Design an enzyme around this catalytic site. Structure first.
Site, PDB file in Angstrom:
ATOM      1  N   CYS A   1      58.841 109.014  72.528  1.00 45.68           N
ATOM      2  CA  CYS A   1      58.436 109.456  71.269  1.00 45.68           C
ATOM      3  C   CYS A   1      58.534 110.998  70.962  1.00 45.68           C
ATOM      4  O   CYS A   1      57.584 111.715  70.985  1.00 45.68           O
ATOM      5  CB  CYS A   1      57.125 108.701  70.835  1.00 45.68           C
ATOM      6  SG  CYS A   1      57.403 106.970  70.870  1.00 45.68           S
TER       7      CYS A   1
HETATM    8  C1  SRM Z   1      56.217 106.914  61.676  1.00 42.50           C
HETATM    9  C2  SRM Z   1      54.968 106.228  62.442  1.00 42.50           C
HETATM   10  C3  SRM Z   1      54.755 104.790  61.951  1.00 42.50           C
HETATM   11  C4  SRM Z   1      54.451 104.576  60.460  1.00 42.50           C
HETATM   12  O1  SRM Z   1      55.327 104.042  59.769  1.00 42.50           O
HETATM   13  O2  SRM Z   1      53.353 104.952  59.988  1.00 42.50           O
HETATM   14  C5  SRM Z   1      55.192 106.209  63.961  1.00 42.50           C
HETATM   15  C6  SRM Z   1      56.412 106.048  64.523  1.00 42.50           C
HETATM   16  C7  SRM Z   1      56.783 106.060  65.842  1.00 42.50           C
HETATM   17  N1  SRM Z   1      55.930 106.213  66.898  1.00 42.50           N
HETATM   18 FE1  SRM Z   1      53.838 106.421  66.785  1.00 42.50          FE
HETATM   19  N2  SRM Z   1      54.056 106.394  64.683  1.00 42.50           N
HETATM   20  C8  SRM Z   1      52.987 106.632  63.799  1.00 42.50           C
HETATM   21  C9  SRM Z   1      51.641 106.612  64.161  1.00 42.50           C
HETATM   22  C10 SRM Z   1      51.064 106.381  65.427  1.00 42.50           C
HETATM   23  C11 SRM Z   1      49.662 106.111  65.728  1.00 42.50           C
HETATM   24  C12 SRM Z   1      48.525 106.216  64.708  1.00 42.50           C
HETATM   25  C13 SRM Z   1      48.029 107.604  64.306  1.00 42.50           C
HETATM   26  O3  SRM Z   1      48.550 108.637  64.800  1.00 42.50           O
HETATM   27  O4  SRM Z   1      47.099 107.671  63.479  1.00 42.50           O
HETATM   28  C14 SRM Z   1      49.547 105.735  67.047  1.00 42.50           C
HETATM   29  C15 SRM Z   1      48.268 105.333  67.784  1.00 42.50           C
HETATM   30  C16 SRM Z   1      47.422 106.459  68.379  1.00 42.50           C
HETATM   31  C17 SRM Z   1      47.999 107.017  69.660  1.00 42.50           C
HETATM   32  O5  SRM Z   1      48.466 108.165  69.653  1.00 42.50           O
HETATM   33  O6  SRM Z   1      47.996 106.296  70.679  1.00 42.50           O
HETATM   34  C18 SRM Z   1      50.883 105.795  67.562  1.00 42.50           C
HETATM   35  C19 SRM Z   1      51.272 105.505  68.864  1.00 42.50           C
HETATM   36  C20 SRM Z   1      52.532 105.539  69.452  1.00 42.50           C
HETATM   37  C21 SRM Z   1      52.839 105.223  70.841  1.00 42.50           C
HETATM   38  C22 SRM Z   1      51.847 104.783  71.923  1.00 42.50           C
HETATM   39  C23 SRM Z   1      51.227 105.985  72.624  1.00 42.50           C
HETATM   40  C24 SRM Z   1      50.242 105.583  73.713  1.00 42.50           C
HETATM   41  O7  SRM Z   1      49.817 106.469  74.481  1.00 42.50           O
HETATM   42  O8  SRM Z   1      49.885 104.385  73.822  1.00 42.50           O
HETATM   43  C25 SRM Z   1      54.209 105.410  70.946  1.00 42.50           C
HETATM   44  C26 SRM Z   1      55.083 105.225  72.202  1.00 42.50           C
HETATM   45  C27 SRM Z   1      55.388 106.505  72.975  1.00 42.50           C
HETATM   46  O9  SRM Z   1      54.877 107.582  72.599  1.00 42.50           O
HETATM   47  O10 SRM Z   1      56.155 106.465  73.963  1.00 42.50           O
HETATM   48  C28 SRM Z   1      54.726 105.812  69.665  1.00 42.50           C
HETATM   49  C29 SRM Z   1      56.051 105.998  69.306  1.00 42.50           C
HETATM   50  C30 SRM Z   1      56.646 106.200  68.076  1.00 42.50           C
HETATM   51  C31 SRM Z   1      58.138 106.470  67.738  1.00 42.50           C
HETATM   52  C32 SRM Z   1      58.238 108.037  67.857  1.00 42.50           C
HETATM   53  C33 SRM Z   1      59.164 105.694  68.670  1.00 42.50           C
HETATM   54  C34 SRM Z   1      60.543 106.331  68.879  1.00 42.50           C
HETATM   55  O11 SRM Z   1      60.886 106.671  70.030  1.00 42.50           O
HETATM   56  O12 SRM Z   1      61.289 106.498  67.894  1.00 42.50           O
HETATM   57  C35 SRM Z   1      58.222 105.894  66.341  1.00 42.50           C
HETATM   58  C36 SRM Z   1      59.277 106.425  65.419  1.00 42.50           C
HETATM   59  C37 SRM Z   1      59.702 105.384  64.395  1.00 42.50           C
HETATM   60  C38 SRM Z   1      60.756 105.883  63.449  1.00 42.50           C
HETATM   61  O13 SRM Z   1      61.885 105.370  63.512  1.00 42.50           O
HETATM   62  O14 SRM Z   1      60.464 106.791  62.632  1.00 42.50           O
HETATM   63  N3  SRM Z   1      53.670 105.875  68.797  1.00 42.50           N
HETATM   64  N4  SRM Z   1      51.751 106.173  66.593  1.00 42.50           N
HETATM   65  C39 SRM Z   1      53.600 106.901  62.337  1.00 42.50           C
HETATM   66  C40 SRM Z   1      53.879 108.353  61.832  1.00 42.50           C
HETATM   67  C41 SRM Z   1      52.681 109.199  61.578  1.00 42.50           C
HETATM   68  C42 SRM Z   1      53.052 110.568  60.965  1.00 42.50           C
HETATM   69  O15 SRM Z   1      52.320 110.987  60.050  1.00 42.50           O
HETATM   70  O16 SRM Z   1      54.061 111.202  61.351  1.00 42.50           O
END
Ligand code: SRM
Ligand code: SRM
Ligand code: SF4
Ligand code: SF4
Ligand code: SF4
Ligand code: SF4
Ligand code: SF4
Ligand code: SF4
Ligand code: SF4
Ligand code: SF4
Ligand SMILES: O=S([O-])[O-]
Ligand SMILES: O=S([O-])[O-]
Lengths: 435, 385, 104, 385, 435, 104
Positions: free
Chosen positions: F103
């Protein structure tokens, strides 16, 4: 006799002193009014006090590590032990404990106990543990040569066997059950006796990855604490309705009958309040008391025993009885303490208990092959998974098997469940998705 | 001198009787019990230590429960047999908490039995058969071997139990608690018995890593077993050199060792006991019955109290304090755990006056997380001042 | 203690086990021979001892009962018929392995 | 033509502004907010989707909440702005659940605003700014990228979300539930968003181990990263062959693989996406507020439902059933998790009609033991038959 | 391309259709009413629909793995993405997402949003995510050459920076706090805004073992879900008493004031019952209702908010306000989901928020050094232990730190707190205990 | 695609990273300068490239930022002064290492 300043202090106080009692036996063996030719030192208990006193002084045990003794034919039953100051306390140079098989729920007759004492006074220290935690009669302290002599007498003269010790099925035990309790859902003592006789070979000859224990409770009150202290716990219950005597209920409300059979009599808790003490404490809130009538929605009763425990004369157990099987309980080492996990919610528990025995043998077949060296059933379950346990016992998974479903999505599927299996060609994948 | 039983050491397998198990319980049943087994109607606690069961046909069996030291002499067992012969036609039984019960079928015989038992004391003065242990009381203490017989204890068993029961004698001869209070003690973390599921639990613990007898370990030990005996993987196999000699042995990472002593159990070359280092950890809140609330483990509230033979004052006082605060603050039918669940942990420490220490916070593997507090819900107590 | 048999000397503990595996020799088997309820050694008693010794040298531990039976092909009952004291106190003691440890 | 912003690719660091962060929220406050912030007295929910907050000085601010698709066009944002300028002096805000809120300071303007919002629809039909989401209702769904933009999904996000809100629309525009029901969806186990703390959680999952591109793995991947990315240790380093030569790669034990896809996240040569294999797991019972009961995780109640674009009927039907049964059986103020804690899991399944599978029984590490049932307390259900 | 039967189905139904919305933007770009000279294909959104339609048919995503793009000076802020069918959908060959820093609690003016839309219409797809789950404004889809162009116009003309991505501090967000809520215990928005500016370096340049998130809640209701979705959660509360206006209490009992501000008006639950809906539901049972008067034993109040939530006009938060710090929340990967664990029960929450910042910086100093590669704070806590976290933040252990004390006796001690230390001589031991 | 520069061929992906670390050559750096906002290569830049290359060969993964700074003695700010795009897109790309994942 050795001076015992510290232990003497434990002769004061109201509670029966183990020191005064040991001293009495030291006195007894000293006078030897029977004229016995003691097979081990008459002064054995004297040296036991002496060394215990020493330990009180230095705050450290004076027994050497382990010990390996026993009787031909069995791989356990006797816990060897040698003091680490034989010179100072010759009387306990050898101080082996012998575990003797006890009758279910410990009912005895003077004649029987007396005959055992006769044997022990002659070939032992004169000291015992009236029932180790698992249940065995414990003969505390004797020498190696006396082991076979004792075993010969016990089996030929007293028709009594040794208990279990080591990596096998230990001595089973039950609550008094139907012998003197109106809450017993099945004959706990009979199951215990029969199963002990049935698996004698597994109890006398270590064939398991580790120790294994059976305990049988008549109802959820757990008077033998089976789901906390045995790998395989059988706890009685019923499946029909609780029996309610409305007239008896009025007696409690009226004050004729004492709540909980007078268990809180030594203190003033006020007049009985059926709503505050029963209906309102019911776990599920499935009880109702309206217009002088007590009602129970048995469908939502988890049969926790509380209402019955409180109004024994008004509320009875059901007539369609059986037992629940809970497994895995163990003390902490290595990975942590465990309590029995519900495996069979309701199973028949009538003589000769075949259904129960089927579960037992199915679990053994599995654990005997899958369990690692010195790994308790409970631990094998944690390592291999509850689902595995369900498969080998032919038990269908039900909501009752959990206190809560999983909150992680790391779910395993059997290849047969997934259409197309797991054999894939990345080549065809690239056909749709370019790198 | 030697007196033979008939055994022949020259032919050890000849005439050997095996697999006969224990005698059957029915052979020792008092008449009234054998006749009404499974036909009981109800029961009631007449007085502290005395019960009566009533069959559906009307028969009655009275029971007198007496305290006992568990560790006893044949003379004591004979005196119990003498009593049973006198009032109970030779019958008697032992409970799952090691108390002794005598049973009779009529109220006059009962009154006689009780008066007699009360006339039995040792020379030193302690009661031989104190009556009690029923209802909301503090019955006997489930305990272990201690220095009397085991090689892995961190404390004694018989001594502490006698000291604690002497302090809690009133609570055994009376029924004035909100619910039963089970006290159990374990001589080491193997925790034989019921320490992990009692209202109050006492477990002996070490505070120092094992000493390693490098010179003899190899010969005395199966290395791999000692390595696998450690929950924290503190032990690893090494090639050591002692007195210019190459020998197989093990090394202990003192930073990963929490002095559980399991490695010693598997290897005599790794002894750990220590007079000043060893002590007792105090636990509370466990229960096994399924009444109302589900069963629960006891929790460590005092990480360490020193061994103080022969009466363990420090430990005994804390136990009494817990019982006193509980007895006063708990509601009817509330077990000590039920009580702490209602009031909350910070409140428990506040009422008992017990010091809280970081040692009580679980740090053992993934599961530890669940012991931390994941909520904003808390009460302000002197702890936050 | 110190054992003296067939012109040999073995260092032993209170239980009758050799204090050092390397001090094992055929004379030993003939010494503890009777103390373990065995009047004459057979090809089977040997096959077990041999296996236990090969195992120990290879794994640093005595094999689990299930493994002893699986390899030798001797069922538990047969093991006892050969060593009345059982695999631990009997075979392992005679094979020169260190005394068993744990519960019991 | 190339229309430059002024940036100079030849001198990239020239005129570069950095570390300025976002604009301060204060710059965009409606006058009534800026003035009374921190001085609010109370609030009242006037209707579904309409709030009023009253300051200590009597000033009022009315809020109209509107649902939104989260994924939106500039044209749609300009329409919200058009409305904001017409009735709110150019002000508006977005909520933590991605709904839009328009604020006005007087009743008459509120009526005009509301009347206008109801008339805005798309050609196709759907409401542009549906009023609702307040009180005891289902207010939008926190969700992810799905097939719209991410590479690790196991399902879509916008599609399922649209299908579910359509079927629960009546729950958005009304306040008839026992308490708020939070729904959330994540297209893969990374579980972005709030699936793990919602009343109903939807997570995309795989049912097939990853495919291995040996020819390029060691080229595109940092092997130690792929190995360490596996929660179940199913990935191990190995030697593979490519064109008959020796190359470094990884081997996956299908018996230890639970198809989480974390290895793919770290290594592009381990794809696992699959149309028939992928689906959705359904969870229920979590919450994040501390109201009465502490916060809790959502639990897996249905291990798998297939992906069925464009409306996922099977999944949608399951969600609806759970809401209906919960709304009909739970007590006032009870969140789904509260309700289930009260009735019991076996009763939950009995009432919902959902089939239970061993797949829902936890088997991940030692904490799994805690999800099992260490009590005799259970109710008889058709499952025992 | 344009034929989208499956997606068209999603234009039906009441809920605002993202499909209908995307189609409108496609029509707008085709018409190009403002004569814009689109700097990426005008048909970008058209191809988005086409490829989404394709994924709907195959049930499989069509975006290539990852992507690494960005702007000079920063190590994150843009999530690059390339479609896996460039030839079939050139419109989204490049389809990067730009994360734009948003104002605290998302308050906006039309002038600001329109300015943003003007830049994105010219240099982007015209599609967005009005707020990614962490809080950022999301500009969905552009080509690499426009990243620097967009960053230039955003900073220079709109005074707006990029949001966060990568192994650093992500964009912080708060509930609306004091701006429009009477339960707010501190100015959530200001704290969020100040720390975001204070830690701009840590947010734009990845210097952490892994991702780290900040979330601020004005009270335990958790409107931004900080103790679920942030590594460091700040949740306001008060230390004094709940304010009670008996006159307002009476209005609730009388029916003039509706419970929970009318949150349950859609169903006939019946007339308010203060006993069954408030006093009786209080988790600690610290409330009393007698002779018409409502009271609260604040000492036993856990401030769960229920009573206040239910009678907001009668019960108010206290005046002595601050906040709690709970840490380690995270989604499952790798070791399991985690919610925030209470660290600082009560701390000051007023600008410049030095007290809060000190805890933040003490945690980073430790975690930045001890955290394993891509290990979240929550997992470092499990691995290293809660005790260590307390030491690095200079926090005294208190009962409030546990929901339950440990039930395993594997207690670690510091050598310095054990008389005699750990260096012992086996030969001396051998003097009291013979081998 | 394949970068053609100074008589060398470099297979890359859409982001400019070498598909094969082994194809790395000093020419690769001279080629990448411009795109990574670098005017002239300094000994400091080289010191970092060499470190990254050594670590990758030895550990099979790119080093954590804290390790990069620890060994080279360059704080993050400096790392960016040398490589405007950062340690990943900047230094690692130029060192020939594989594109960063996870991520962001
Ligand atoms: C864009 C978003 C989803 C959405 O449509 O809302 C998102 C998108 C992605 N997240 Fe996130 N996360 C998003 C909110 C979250 C949240 C909720 C929050 O922050 O309120 C969580 C849960 C809280 C946390 O931090 O655990 C979250 C926990 C994860 C995880 C699991 C981390 C863990 O320790 O368990 C991953 C996986 C990783 O990091 O390897 C991840 C990974 C990813 C990646 C970066 C995966 C990747 O390698 O590309 C995703 C990108 C998708 C894309 O194509 O754009 N994302 N992710 C959110 C963007 C927020 C922003 O304002 O930029
Ligand atoms: C507008 C918004 C704040 C913001 O944008 O910063 C908001 C606003 C209010 N939330 N909560 C907002 C997200 C949340 C979240 C976050 C989420 O769902 O992702 C939660 C956590 C959910 C959970 O508990 O698991 C949340 C849990 C609550 C609760 C606790 C309710 C409960 O029964 O557990 C209350 C208390 C109540 O309703 O009485 C509450 C109460 C309130 C009050 C009544 C506070 C006040 O005095 O003004 C606000 C008006 C609510 C209404 O609809 O009438 N808000 N509130 C958010 C609107 C989301 C939406 O569009 O619907
Ligand atoms: S466990 Fe139940 S059946 Fe057995 S003695 Fe106790 S109360 Fe009676
Ligand atoms: S046995 Fe327990 S669960 Fe059933 S009615 Fe009585 S108090 Fe309620
Ligand atoms: S509690 Fe420990 S010391 S008795 Fe059991 S193993 Fe010996
Ligand atoms: S005492 Fe326990 S924790 Fe220490 S090395 Fe021995 S087994 Fe490991
Ligand atoms: S990583 Fe992509 S799929 Fe998975 S829930 Fe977050 S948006
Ligand atoms: S998919 Fe998940 S469980 Fe299977 S190999 Fe990769 S990281 Fe391990
Ligand atoms: S978290 Fe509390 S303070 Fe913030 S908007 Fe929700 S209720 Fe109001
Ligand atoms: S805030 Fe919660 S804990 Fe405190 S009195 Fe109200 S309801 Fe009871
Ligand atoms: O220490 S004993 O077992 O020889
Ligand atoms: O797949 S992309 O990252 O080249």
């Amino acid at each position: 006799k050795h001076p015992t300043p510290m232990l003497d202090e434990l002769e004061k106080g109201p509670w029966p002193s183990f020191v005064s009692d040991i001293k009495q036996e030291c006195d007894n063996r000293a006078k030897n009014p029977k004229g016995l030719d003691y097979q081990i030192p008459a002064e054995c208990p004297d040296d036991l006090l002496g060394i215990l006193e020493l330990s009180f002084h230095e705050g450290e045990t004076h027994w050497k590590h382990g010990g390996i003794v026993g009787v031909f034919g069995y791989g356990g039953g006797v816990i060897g032990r040698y003091c680490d100051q034989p010179e100072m306390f010759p009387g306990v140079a050898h101080f082996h404990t012998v575990r003797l098989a006890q009758p279910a729920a410990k009912y005895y007759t003077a004649e029987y106990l007396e005959a055992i004492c006769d044997v022990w006074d002659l070939r032992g220290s004169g000291l015992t543990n009236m029932h180790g935690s698992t249940g065995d009669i414990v003969l505390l302290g004797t020498q190696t040569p006396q082991l076979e002599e004792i075993f010969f007498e016990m089996t030929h003269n007293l028709n009594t066997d040794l208990g279990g010790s080591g990596s096998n099925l230990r001595t089973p035990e039950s609550c008094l059950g139907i012998s003197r309790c109106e809450f017993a859902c099945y004959d706990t003592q009979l199951m215990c006796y029969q199963l002990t006789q049935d698996y004698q070979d597994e109890l006398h000859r270590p064939a398991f990855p580790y120790k294994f224990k059976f305990k049988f409770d008549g109802c959820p009150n757990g008077c033998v604490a089976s789901m906390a202290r045995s790998d395989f716990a059988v706890i009685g219950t019923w499946k029909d309705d609780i029996k309610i005597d409305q007239e008896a209920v009025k007696a409690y409300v009226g004050g004729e009958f004492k709540p909980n059979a007078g268990a809180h009599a030594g203190r003033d808790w006020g007049k009985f309040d059926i709503e505050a003490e029963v209906v309102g404490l019911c776990p599920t809130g499935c009880m109702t008391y309206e217009s002088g009538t007590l009602s129970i929605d048995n469908k939502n009763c988890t049969r926790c025993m509380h209402c019955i425990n409180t109004m024994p004369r008004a509320l009875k157990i059901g007539d369609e009885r059986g037992a629940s099987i809970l497994v895995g309980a163990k003390a902490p080492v290595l990975d942590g303490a465990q309590m029995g996990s519900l495996l069979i919610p309701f199973i028949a528990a009538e003589e000769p208990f075949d259904e129960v025995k089927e579960v037992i043998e199915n679990i053994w077949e599995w654990w005997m092959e899958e369990g690692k060296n010195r790994e308790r059933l409970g631990e094998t379950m944690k390592r291999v998974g509850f689902q595995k346990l369900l498969e080998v016992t032919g038990t269908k998974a039900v909501p009752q098997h959990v206190s809560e479903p999983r909150h992680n999505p790391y779910i395993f599927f059997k290849e047969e469940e997934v259409p197309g299996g797991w054999s894939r060609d990345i080549s065809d994948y690239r056909k749709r998705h370019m790198r | 001198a030697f007196i033979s039983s008939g055994y022949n050491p020259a032919k050890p397998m000849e005439n050997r009787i095996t697999d006969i198990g224990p005698r059957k319980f029915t052979e020792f049943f008092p008449p009234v019990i054998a006749k009404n087994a499974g036909n009981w109607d109800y029961h009631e606690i007449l007085e502290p230590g005395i019960l009566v069961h009533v069959a559906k046909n009307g028969d009655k069996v009275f029971t007198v429960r007496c305290g006992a030291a568990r560790l006893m002499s044949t003379s004591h067992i004979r005196e119990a047999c003498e009593i049973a012969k006198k009032f109970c036609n030779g019958h008697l039984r032992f409970t799952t908490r090691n108390n002794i019960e005598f049973m009779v079928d009529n109220e006059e015989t009962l009154k006689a039995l009780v008066a007699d038992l009360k006339t039995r004391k040792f020379a030193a003065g302690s009661f031989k058969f104190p009556i009690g242990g029923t209802g909301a009381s503090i019955s006997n203490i489930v305990h272990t071997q201690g220095w009397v017989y085991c090689h892995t204890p961190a404390t004694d068993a018989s001594g502490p139990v006698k000291a604690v029961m002497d302090e809690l004698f009133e609570e055994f001869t009376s029924m004035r608690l909100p619910a039963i209070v089970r006290v159990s003690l374990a001589c080491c973390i193997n925790m034989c018995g019921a320490v992990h599921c009692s209202d109050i639990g006492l477990v002996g613990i070490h505070r120092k890593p094992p000493m390693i007898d490098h010179e003899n370990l190899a010969e005395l030990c199966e290395i791999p077993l000692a390595v696998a005996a450690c929950p924290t993987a503190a032990v690893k196999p090494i090639t050591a050199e002692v007195n210019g000699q190459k020998v197989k042995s093990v090394a202990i990472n003192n930073d990963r060792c929490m002095y559980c002593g399991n490695c010693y159990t598997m290897c005599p070359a790794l002894p750990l006991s220590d007079g000043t280092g060893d002590g007792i950890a105090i636990m509370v809140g466990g229960k096994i019955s399924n009444r109302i609330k589900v069963p629960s483990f006891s929790k460590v509230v005092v990480a360490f109290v020193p061994n103080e033979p022969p009466r363990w004052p420090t430990m005994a006082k804390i136990v009494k304090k817990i019982v006193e605060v509980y007895a006063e603050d708990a509601r009817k039918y509330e077990r000590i755990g039920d009580w702490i669940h209602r009031i909350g942990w910070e409140t428990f420490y506040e009422k008992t006056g017990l010091e809280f220490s970081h040692h009580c916070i679980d740090d053992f593997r993934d599961p530890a997380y669940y012991t931390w507090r994941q909520s904003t819900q808390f009460k302000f107590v002197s702890f936050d001042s | 203690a110190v054992v003296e048999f067939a012109g040999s000397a073995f260092e032993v503990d209170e239980d009758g086990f050799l204090n050092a595996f390397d001090d094992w020799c055929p004379e030993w088997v003939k010494y503890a021979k009777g103390s373990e309820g065995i009047g004459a050694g057979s090809a089977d008693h040997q096959k077990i001892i041999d296996f236990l010794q090969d195992y120990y040298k290879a794994n640093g531990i005595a094999p689990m009962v299930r493994i002893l039976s699986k390899v030798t092909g001797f069922k538990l009952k047969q093991i006892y018929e050969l060593f009345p004291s059982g695999p631990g106190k009997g075979a392992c003691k005679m094979a020169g392995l260190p005394k068993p440890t744990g519960c019991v």
